[model samples]
Target: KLQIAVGIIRNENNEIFITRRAADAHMANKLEFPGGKIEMGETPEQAVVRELQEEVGITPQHFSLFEKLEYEFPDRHITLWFWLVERWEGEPWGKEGQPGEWMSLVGLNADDFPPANEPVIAKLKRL
Candidate 1:
């Protein structure tokens, strides 16, 4: 049951795509990458692509594995697989009514994200 994928989508401008979780969603109102749970029989790559389309309205043209972490939350244990999306089709928008933004990777602040995203910020900063 511990399966999730997140996209570190980078545009030509060297910005990364991030979204604010809906107030009613889990990890509500926190800024995080746009992605979700992997469904049965789907590869992590497939899940990241599908989730991005569903949440942010973009289709990744190229992506690769970046980082993976397993962590425990109060209610669940999960593995978060991160992917680097180097190319994609369509402009990304907050299709799910969440707030979305493209932020410079160097300027991204760790405190702006959910607790689960803290480690990923350091990894992204090094890239």
Candidate 2:
């Protein structure tokens, strides 16, 4: 079983933060939330906060658990925990050399994200 966390970081304009992995990184060039695995004894929420800090240097002052999805890709099955953060400590930058873009929720380009998140991104765009 594989586990990962993803953050839906929103700015004052309600635009969400999306990022692209550096070409040399695993899952190279795929766009995704900047989050990672949950360590032992850590809840998904805690994991997300830790990852958000590590990956983007944001410690959200207030946020909410938004959604969770389970998927069965050809090679693996995993659950992705998604969190929505409205307020945070710092502005997002291309930390770790990764590139990030702030995008409108209604215009989120599913084609720009991973195949696994097409439906979710589409749904968010429609909302």
Candidate 3:
């Protein structure tokens, strides 16, 4: 199974930092928390931090592993480790020129994200 690291970043205002998948990528056009693959020899923590810097313009200053799950997209299967980024450095933006935003936790909609994100959504609603 492919291993991926995901970041659920939050700003001082408590809004979730989110970004969209590439228009040409899997789950295209859907909103997603910023993340990417966890390479060999890298822990999910390192992957999350590295991915955030590569996908967005931030480096998580403080974070914690939140949840872990597997999701099977029609074209792929992946095990994702979700991290709660409580604090970060630099502002968040789509470093790769993808669409992004800061939505209130309550404003996040299941329909907006890829189906794999459903569990993360449920966990967030309790916050």
Query: How many Å off is the CA of 110 in candidate 2?
Result: 1.2
Residue-level lDDT tens digits of model 2 in 5-24: 88888886868888898778
What do the candidate models score in CA lDDT, each in turn?
0.88, 0.80, 0.89
Instruction: Give candidate 2 misplaced runs (Cα > 4 Å).
Output: 24-26
Predicted structure 3: lDDT: 0.89
lDDT comparing candidate 1 with the true structure = 0.88
For model 2, where is the 10-residue window of minimal lDDT?
118-127
Q: How many backbone clashes does candidate 1 have?
A: 0
Candidate 1 lDDT over residue span 43-119, tens digit each: 99899999999999989876888888888888888899989998898889989887888999999988888787788
Give the distance in Å from residue 101's predicted Cα in candidate 1 to where it truly belongs: 1.1
**Compared with the true structure, what per-residue lDDT tens digits does model 3 show for residues 35-120?**
99999999888999999999998999778888999998887899999999988889898789988889999888999898988988
- TM-score, every prediction: 0.93, 0.88, 0.94
Task: Sort every candidate by TM-score, greatest first.
Answer: 3, 1, 2
Where in model 1 is the C-alpha error above 4 Å? none
- Model 1 — TM-score against the truth? 0.93
Any runs in candidate 3 off by more than 4 Å, and if so which? none
